[PDB]
Amino acid sequence: WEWPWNRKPTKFPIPSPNPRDKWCRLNLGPAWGGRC
């Protein structure tokens, strides 16, 4: 009860990731549609 753990981080590591992150450039399929 005396150590710096306030306001935890954000913006996970490594830039706009390829892996399942903002992926999809067109209309998907399996469990998608219209949306990303």
UniProtKB/Swiss-Prot annotation:
Function, as annotated: Male seminal protein which triggers short- and long-term post-mating behavioral responses (PMR) in female Drosophila. Binds initially to sperm where it is later cleaved to release an active peptide within the female reproductive tract. Signals via the sex peptide receptor (SPR) in female flies; may also act via other receptors.
Family according to the record: Belongs to the Drosophila sex peptide family.
Compartment(s) where it occurs, according to its Swiss-Prot or TrEMBL record: Secreted
UniProt keyword Disulfide bond, yes or no: yes
GO molecular function, one term: hormone activity
Region: Sufficient to induce PMR, residue numbers: 17-36
Impact after mutating W32A: Complete loss of activity. Complete loss of activity
Keywords, sorted A to Z: Behavior, Cleavage on pair of basic residues, Disulfide bond, Hydroxylation, Secreted, Signal
Superkingdom in the source lineage: Eukaryota
Distribution of this protein across tissues and organs: Main cells of the accessory glands of males (paragonial gland).
Full-protein interval shown: 20 to 55 of 55
Modifications the protein undergoes after translation, according to the UniProt entry: Sperm-bound protein is cleaved to release an active C-terminal peptide. Gradual release from stored sperm may function to prolong PMR and enhance male reproductive success.
Modified residues (Hydroxyproline): P9, P13, P15, P17, P19
Gene Ontology CC annotations of this record: extracellular region; extracellular space
Residues flagged as site, Cleavage: R7, K8
Stretch list, region Essential for binding to sperm: 1-14
Phenotype upon loss of function: Viable and fertile. Males are able to transfer sperm but can only induce weak PMR behaviors in females.
Protein name in UniProt: Accessory gland-specific peptide 70A
Cystine residue pairs: C24-C36
Listed GO biological process terms: adult feeding behavior; G protein-coupled receptor signaling pathway; multi-organism reproductive process; negative regulation of female receptivity; negative regulation of female receptivity, post-mating; regulation of egg-laying behavior; regulation of female receptivity, post-mating; regulation of juvenile hormone biosynthetic process
